[PDB]
Design a protein around this nucleic acid. Structure first.
Ligand SMILES: [Mg+2]
Ligand SMILES: [Mg+2]
Length: 55
RNA sequence: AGUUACUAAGGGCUUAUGGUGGAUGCCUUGGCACUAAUAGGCGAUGAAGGACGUGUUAACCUGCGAUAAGCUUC
């Protein structure tokens, strides 16, 4: 499902996605280390989407 | 003058009960010996075996490898 949508995307847009998700993942981990992450599942969702984009 | 019981500090015997202990009996996600087939290898495209790390999850075990408790396709 999601893999089909990313396949529709071009390569340059995909690398923009990966750098943006890397930044967001860093922010989520820092907020968790400060006890300010209400949604603790977005870390896992970010990592899976990151892994899928890498595939 | 004569023959005399009671005593139980404690102990002995019988029976009953309580406590420590895990013998006997019943059972087992475990072992042993084989039968009928399959197969008889992995590695410089990095092996067998380990260290480290990975959780929204204290440690340990298991899974996994910076795509890290999982990624794609049929
Ligand atoms: Mg007495
Ligand atoms: Mg007595």
């Amino acid at each position: 499902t999601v893999a089909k949508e990313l396949r529709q995307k071009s390569s340059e847009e995909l690398v923009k996605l990966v750098i943006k998700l890397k930044g967001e993942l860093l922010e989520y981990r820092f907020k968790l280390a400060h006890g300010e992450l209400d949604k603790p599942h977005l870390i896992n969702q970010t990592r899976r989407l990151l892994a899928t984009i890498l595939t």
